[PDB]
């Protein structure tokens, strides 16, 4: 990596400057170099890695869905052939999106997950792994779409088993895991009933645990419970 000569503490400091500059590519490249120093990450440092890569991949997903739609509009009966340009550009963005996904999964597999012993670290990385297999699945069409989807499911399921046993139902990482896994059921795995059942059960168990919380923890958890409520309102 090209960050191999910069101090870990300097890479973390510059990741946070880059976030404020809304320079997410830089943010991601900094947190990549930080991971590659080989030390476990802190809670704050995990969020910077998450936030950095989600904004990079988020620009590419948005861009991919615009091009995917123009391409299909150009494949109906009564649509004028515009040449290969729309397909070539959709393929280029998709290829670039896939490289980010493979890079994030590389960091998770070398060696963030095997060294994550705590519930919070391990559940966070296994969620990340399910999310980035999910992004690969959104654009997969060929031979291992099924294997990609099962890789997402499998990582999502190990995270859910650990959070169920080791974290309270209002834990933001648990609530975010369940929000994402539900959306997986709904739009990747074609299990809308599984998607809705996970969302209600997650909302209800958290509701019944809010009484144990500080005002600050309450604002954190309720924020995410409202995302679950919104999804449910949309699917029902």
């Amino acid at each position: 990596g090209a960050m191999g000569s910069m101090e870990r503490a300097s890479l973390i400091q510059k990741a946070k400057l880059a976030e404020q500059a809304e320079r997410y590519e830089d943010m991601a490249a900094f947190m990549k170099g930080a991971v590659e120093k080989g030390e476990e990450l802190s809670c704050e440092e995990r969020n910077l890695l998450s936030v950095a890569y989600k904004n990079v991949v988020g620009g590419q997903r948005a861009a991919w869905r615009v091009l995917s739609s123009i391409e299909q509009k150009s494949n109906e009966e009564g649509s004028e052939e515009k040449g290969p340009e729309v397909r070539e550009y959709r393929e280029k963005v998709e290829t670039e999106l896939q490289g980010v996904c493979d890079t994030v999964l590389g960091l998770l597999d070398s060696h963030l997950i095997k060294e994550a012993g705590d519930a919070e670290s391990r559940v966070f990385y296994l969620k990340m792994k399910g999310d980035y297999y999910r992004y690969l699945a959104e654009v997969a069409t060929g031979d291992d779409k099924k294997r990609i989807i099962d890789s997402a499911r499998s990582a999502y399921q190990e995270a859910m088993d650990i959070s169920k046993k080791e974290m309270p139902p209002t834990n933001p990482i648990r609530l975010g895991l369940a929000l994402n896994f539900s959306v997986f059921h709904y739009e990747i795995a074609n299990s809308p009933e599984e998607a809705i059942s996970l969302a209600k059960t997650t909302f209800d168990e958290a509701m019944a645990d809010l009484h144990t919380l500080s005002e600050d923890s309450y604002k954190d958890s309720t924020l995410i419970m409202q995302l679950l409520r919104d999804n449910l309102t949309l699917w029902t």
Binding site: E22, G176, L179, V183, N231, W235
Partner: peptide, 10 residues
């Protein structure tokens, strides 16, 4: 109106 996943984009 798009379904929510976390984290959210800037």
């Amino acid at each position: 109106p798009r379904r929510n996943t976390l984290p959210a984009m800037d």
